[PDB]
Write a protein that binds this ligand. Structure first.
Ligand SMILES: O=C(O)CNc1ncnc2oc(-c3ccccc3)c(-c3ccccc3)c12
Length: 257
């Protein structure tokens, strides 16, 4: 019941590799994440339990090495379901977005922000269920019911919210909302809107000026685009929140059997 074969390397991570491990008796599969910040990742993982969040099973100290034992997601990355310049069918996009909201609602409800939401970190199981992955940059933004503001910049530039480049301190939750928006834009367009949301960025100025007759917006369609108008608001205090994304017309539009 103990004893696991490493059966292939799933990918190269930035830190180690990730290995598929199968159980010699039960044939159960797990991903094994090898690290030669990591203590906090393990600590946060122990906190987490939800259907659209990669399951943490355990961890091995083994000398110097840290072995992380996580849900195997045989669907790979949502990134690989996005066709360059096309995106994916809108009903597929909408389902993925529902599940991503479920995962993000769950984290925010336990005071956790992930801070690096992007399709490379949205993994898919055998049934195309979406699992949020890699708490490597995640942190606690609410504890004993009291919010702490963030002031450390991290994430990935094309998905980062504007306030994170402009302000010394900023709320955690609107940043994760913004990045879900870029993830939506991608799924529906096959294309990232800007390299960063800086006023030194023409594509960002064009969006603030409302020129939706350009790409990527023009590929999109007025119901999902209207929702994107409420997510990608420069002022995070004015940005739509999750409870209200849930009231959105497109979000609630029937599309998929
Ligand atoms: O990369 C992470 O940090 C965790 N990675 C994973 N965790 C849990 N299950 C997984 O299934 C994969 C995977 C699945 C099918 C094909 C290829 C890879 C991957 C995968 C993906 C890219 C890089 C590294 C691994 C994966």
């Amino acid at each position: 019941v103990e004893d696991w074969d490493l059966v292939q390397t799933l990918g190269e991570g930035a830190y180690g590799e990730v290995q598929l491990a199968v159980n010699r008796v039960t044939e159960e599969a797990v991903a094994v994440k090898i690290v030669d910040n990591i203590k906090k990742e393990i600590c946060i993982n122990k906190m987490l339990n939800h259907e659209n969040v990669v399951k943490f099973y355990g961890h091995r100290r083994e000398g110097n090495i840290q072995y992380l034992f996580l849900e195997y997601c045989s669907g790979g990355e949502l990134f690989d379901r996005i066709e360059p310049d096309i995106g994916m069918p809108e009903p597929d996009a909408q389902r993925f977005f529902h599940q991503l909201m479920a995962g993000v609602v769950y984290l925010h409800g336990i005071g956790i922000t992930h801070r690096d939401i992007k399709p490379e970190n949205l993994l898919l199981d055998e049934r195309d269920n979406l699992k949020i992955s890699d708490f490597g940059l995640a942190t606690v933004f609410r504890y004993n019911n009291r919010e702490r503001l963030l002031n450390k910049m991290c994430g990935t530039l094309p998905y980062v919210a504007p306030e994170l480049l402009k302000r010394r301190e900023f709320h955690a939750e609107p940043v994760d909302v913004w990045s879900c928006g870029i993830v939506l834009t991608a799924m529906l367009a096959g294309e990232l809107p800007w390299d960063q949301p800086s006023d030194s960025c023409q594509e960002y100025s064009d969006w603030k000026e409302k020129k939706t007759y350009l790409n990527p917006w023009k590929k999109i369609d007025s119901a999902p685009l209207a929702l994107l108008h409420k997510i990608l608001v420069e002022n995070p205090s004015a940005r739509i929140t999750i409870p209200d994304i849930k009231k959105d017309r497109w979000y609630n539009k029937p599309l998929k059997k």
